[PDB]
Amino acid sequence: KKARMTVDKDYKIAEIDKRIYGSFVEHLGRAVYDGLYQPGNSKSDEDGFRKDVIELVKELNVPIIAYPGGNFVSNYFWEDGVGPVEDRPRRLDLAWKSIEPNQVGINEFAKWCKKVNAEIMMAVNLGTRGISDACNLLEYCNHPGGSKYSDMRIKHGVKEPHNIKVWCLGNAMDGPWQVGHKTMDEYGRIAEETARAMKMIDPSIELVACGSSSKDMPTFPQWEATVLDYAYDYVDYISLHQYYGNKENDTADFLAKSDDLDDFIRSVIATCDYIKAKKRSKKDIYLSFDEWNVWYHSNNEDANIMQNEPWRIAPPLLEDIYTFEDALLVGLMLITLMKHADRIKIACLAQLINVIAPIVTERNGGAAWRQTIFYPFMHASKYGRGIVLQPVINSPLHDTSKHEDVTDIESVAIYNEEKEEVTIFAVNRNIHEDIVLVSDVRGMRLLEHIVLEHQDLKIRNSVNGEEVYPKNSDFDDGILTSMLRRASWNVIRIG
Amino acid sequence: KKARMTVDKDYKIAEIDKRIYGSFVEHLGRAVYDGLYQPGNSKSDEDGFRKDVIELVKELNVPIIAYPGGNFVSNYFWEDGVGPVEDRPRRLDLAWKSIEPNQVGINEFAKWCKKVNAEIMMAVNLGTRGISDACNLLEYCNHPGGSKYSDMRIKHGVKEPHNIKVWCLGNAMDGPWQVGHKTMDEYGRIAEETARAMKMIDPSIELVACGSSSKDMPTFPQWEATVLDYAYDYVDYISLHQYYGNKENDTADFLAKSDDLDDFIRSVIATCDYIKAKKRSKKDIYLSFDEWNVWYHSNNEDANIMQNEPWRIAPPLLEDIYTFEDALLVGLMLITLMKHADRIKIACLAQLINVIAPIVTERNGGAAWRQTIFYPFMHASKYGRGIVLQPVINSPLHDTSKHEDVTDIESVAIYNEEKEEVTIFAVNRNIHEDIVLVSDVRGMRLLEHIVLEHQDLKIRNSVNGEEVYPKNSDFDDGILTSMLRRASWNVIRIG
Amino acid sequence: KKARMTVDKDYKIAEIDKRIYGSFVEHLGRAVYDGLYQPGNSKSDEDGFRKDVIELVKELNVPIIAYPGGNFVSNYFWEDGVGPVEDRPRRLDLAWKSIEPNQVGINEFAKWCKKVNAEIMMAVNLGTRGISDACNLLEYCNHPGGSKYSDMRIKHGVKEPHNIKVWCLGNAMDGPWQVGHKTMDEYGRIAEETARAMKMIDPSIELVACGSSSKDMPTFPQWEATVLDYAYDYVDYISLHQYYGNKENDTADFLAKSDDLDDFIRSVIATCDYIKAKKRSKKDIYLSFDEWNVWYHSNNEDANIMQNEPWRIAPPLLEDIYTFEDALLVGLMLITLMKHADRIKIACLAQLINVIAPIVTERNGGAAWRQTIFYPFMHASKYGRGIVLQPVINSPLHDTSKHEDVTDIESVAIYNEEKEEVTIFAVNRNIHEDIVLVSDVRGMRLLEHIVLEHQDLKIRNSVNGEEVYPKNSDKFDDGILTSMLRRASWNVIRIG
Ligand SMILES: OC[C@@H]1O[C@@H](O)[C@H](O)[C@H]1O
Ligand SMILES: OC[C@@H]1O[C@@H](O)[C@H](O)[C@H]1O
Ligand SMILES: OC[C@@H]1O[C@@H](O)[C@H](O)[C@H]1O
């Protein structure tokens, strides 16, 4: 019932890179068509972008958006999505068994990222294409002018280069369900050679090597080791993907899965440092966690849609509707991301609009709304800039059906120096027993105490109203005392 | 003089897949140009197809035709053969040192297949092209509309999709004489990935993985093992190729060669089942015998042509003129195919027109006529539909120069119970002795004994007449007693 | 003081293939643009070709020129350089951080080679491209007509096929500074299948497989053995690359480096013979030394030009200005090449115009002069055609900072039978002592003794004048030719 945590400014983990509050838009389902892009809608601007969605994205303070995939990119031909729209083909999207009409391509999606105050992180097709097509796309986007592909961008109506900073070398290609599956050795080579050439066009870019499609793949983490062995000198990040689900309907074990996330991350870091010692390099590889979220609700509808009604434009795929308990895990996942901010410098919640997303528009042009997971992310991105202090914590333990010694209270604190504030994120993942956390600030004024709680752990949000929303609700010597209700998300700020 | 055999509808082998009576047209020599396609000719229809050639193919009841190669496909660019004929290029055909004019492409050959009531088995180029080109060709042929390459087919004048059922992942590429020669691991990888992508576009197709170019390559049968190991989950067949020759002028040892055919088939079946165990699959790989024939007569003239008269259109290559003994061995090969109809589901006489073919057009628009090998195939395709019955047979044996204990009488019975007939196929390949076949027919009337025989084992057919052709030449109890002339082919039907 | 040589016309090494006097033009720096190709210029002809440069090349009697690279070729798309010039794109040259405007492509460069009496040895892109693109280029260039790419050539205004004889399968691709870098097994496989398919289009061409970037690469010589293992039956040559520098500023050691060249050539020959025994083949692979020169003066200015000033048309890259001691090592390398004429059949001075070149044009459109290295190459190419006789030399030796037992004199005799000339090429690389060379022409009138010498080993040529240029002599009565060879000199002594 008690839990003691001592924060101290002097005990840093690292500065937060803001790109860990990024997200991800794939040409999948209604992410784009009847998603952020709805040409005649009364709620859209003259370019067809839903303005209410733009506003909801800006509320999440997303600085970087992965695009356009995802499994989609591994058979995408980028030239299909630029130039006059009347001349753009329709294409089969093999990954998601849909027709892609290519109304949104590089230039429309870059315009959209301007409107939501975000940058693109661009993925290139290394499934069915290779080096020279990555070079062309990079020249098109980043070279000012005076060459075949920069002048082509100019002739398409974009005089200034997009100057995309981070590029991703394909998508995860270790699974037998993706077009252009590669062995680790094949992918290591194409990534090394694509990376080599791209850095010769634009040496200021950063590059992401793709890790395994999940930690459960038998080739994890040898895949990461092999790719980094080949490409180390030319890439800056390795990517990780992780999704969690609660089909077993075990909310106690569900919220313990953040422990598996912590272990996955350290595994990837050890793998990077193993290859570091092997190359005798002084460079550190950072982590790009460019696919993470809860994902399990829509699994069976998606299987129906493929292949019952295949080859639709914008079929409603991956439309997970999230519960309060899902928001609790998304919050736990964010706490775990923060705790490893010394190595994780990029992360993308997957995905942003409609597809397993914090932001939903109702089908056929309907209204936009916030899912339960919208709010833990909004809080983390708003108050979680600054310096991650080392959580030194003793907290009660519990076991679940499949995890052991699960921390009762997961927590981290982030000192914003320019603002003299200190924000403490804490989840009580004791489903039953309320707990108090006593926090010895030895720093270094109790601003507020925002909470995400609800009676019903399976409650949902909808276009008819949010049942889950930040209750701006609930310190005086040096020790801060606030109470963590069972199954709750807590944002405690100090000034 | 005496050989005995028990026929019994309870010792089934398998139901015959009629696709074992298939054939093969490659863009080679006079197969197409000055072959089935002759636009000026008086005997040609509105599309330029020779109508007498069309009639002869239908007499063979060929249900499936492989196209368009062959070594030719390994450097073929299928876009060169579709669209307005005025804009189609002339290409160098490296395999056969010829100019391909591309007057006949997929759409013309598909129309021709309709007129001979056959359908296409399409090979894709995995020599100099790869995944995305195979996907484009499949989309073009099988996707109905609303996408780049399907709409391209429609605009080219073919509104409905061809819906090609069986595709071949390349041609054999183990030979140093083939453009795009692959190692077995290289071919396995590209076959695996091409098949994976193709089945995402059209999951109803079947795919054929290529075997060794012959049983005599050092990489047979490890090539088959390796390809199947990579691609097992996505393919349905493995291909086999076999040609026999009588360059040594030894008819006895020549006719013994279907024994090595049987052994060859067993070797490939064992290879498939070894991999099935390795995979723990419940699927059996079936065999596609998409190249088999006698071929040796024209070998020296083809050296002359490729080496000194290169880059012609329609050079007269591979124009074997077949003898009566060649027809006997073709019959022995058809019997062996029938004996393995449990695993062999597709087979292709290589080839259908002019090129090592049962059908010949003279040259420079001359008349069409039937080679000796035409009639064993016509008999087998006409009456060999139904259930292959296990041959329990005790026959005299003989030695030849290079074969030991060769059975004198080779035989199988097919039981068509929807017509209530039992057709016995038998060859006496003892050339020096006549032999009586006592056939115990555990019942279940004789309707005819049909023969191909001749005194002159080297006699040929020609445009001036057929010397080898079906003769109606000649059981009461339940015991079928049939006299099998030395070096003869026999089709004895009971009902 | 005394070195003795025995020249017998019956002790032969081999007939000299004149393609050992080849050179090389890459789309690099000012080789093409502001070099051989200058449209506006008063010195330029109807095609835009500097006529003064054309005549300078013709004096070197260069029979074959490799083109278009070099690193450049490894990401070159040849179609960008043919067809109407108004429709040719500008492209990023990742190798040299330049813009390639493609005003000179294969058909302009083929015309230029006609004007200097040379042929192209063409390199195909095996970096980012492969089999089918090499087939297309070979058909465009060598197939008469009646097919897609041969007719395309005709449509572009070249009715006759170029009929290019020697093709180079990519460029060396073992280095991490190269677009499309390959492991030895990757390159082995791609070279094998490119070669196989190309020889089906035109069986009369000859093919060069690429060796390592230099002997110093860790994968040398295993790269050469693997590529030859794969492609042996389909290729005719293996390539070698060698450059030398004098950044340590040690003239004696510098001039000893032809000894390393000799060791390098033998190592590659052994490698060929190893694979030959492995293949039980009756065919020897021949050597193509298609990059060799002195190269070091311009390294630092080159590093500055990328970055700081990247993506220019025609940046002034690799503009080494050669000293007299550089010309001596160039002469020593040509002597070494001559001594291995039985296996080296193609060699390429890298490069011909402005880019580490014997011929310079001064930048922004004039005026064109000859570097110090121009002249040993001119002598070797003009008088070094015939039979390499076997060098029997008793030369005094000397040690240097990093080399031992270095001959003071390097010499080789080339017997021309259609002229009754013998030519003795000799270098005295003892920087300190004149040496008399006694040649016993067990033969068989002294025709001349040409000399390249100077008091300043660091003196350079320039547009303002040649400081280094040929002179006579100093200076044969029985069957005994005696000739004093100066301190640090290049010597061409001719008999008739
Ligand atoms: O997040 C959506 C999909 O999940 C993963 O399988 C893919 O990378 C991505 O396309
Ligand atoms: O039947 C002709 C040729 O036989 C084999 O050589 C090839 O696969 C095929 O093109
Ligand atoms: O000679 C110029 C360069 O030297 C080597 O680096 C390359 O092969 C070539 O491009």
Short mmCIF file of C-alpha atoms and ligand atoms in Angstrom, two decimals, chain C residues 24 26 28 70-71 96 171 241 243 291 295 318 350-351 356, ligand 3:
data_model
loop_
_atom_site.label_atom_id
_atom_site.label_comp_id
_atom_site.label_asym_id
_atom_site.label_seq_id
_atom_site.Cartn_x
_atom_site.Cartn_y
_atom_site.Cartn_z
CA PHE C 24 41.68 6.21 -70.17
CA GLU C 26 36.54 9.11 -67.17
CA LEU C 28 35.69 13.14 -64.01
CA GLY C 70 36.30 4.37 -63.47
CA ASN C 71 34.11 4.91 -60.41
CA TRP C 96 32.86 12.55 -57.60
CA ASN C 171 34.66 -1.30 -62.41
CA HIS C 241 45.20 -0.92 -60.89
CA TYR C 243 49.16 4.28 -58.41
CA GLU C 291 44.66 2.08 -64.36
CA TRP C 295 48.94 10.19 -58.36
CA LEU C 318 42.72 15.23 -59.62
CA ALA C 350 45.14 6.89 -66.05
CA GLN C 351 44.15 9.32 -67.31
CA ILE C 356 46.08 12.98 -63.54
O1 LIG D 3 41.55 7.15 -61.98
C1 LIG D 3 40.41 7.66 -61.35
C2 LIG D 3 39.84 6.78 -60.31
O2 LIG D 3 40.82 5.99 -59.65
C3 LIG D 3 40.08 4.94 -59.00
O3 LIG D 3 39.74 5.36 -57.77
C4 LIG D 3 38.87 4.73 -59.84
O4 LIG D 3 38.74 3.42 -60.36
C5 LIG D 3 38.92 5.76 -60.84
O5 LIG D 3 37.64 6.34 -60.97
#
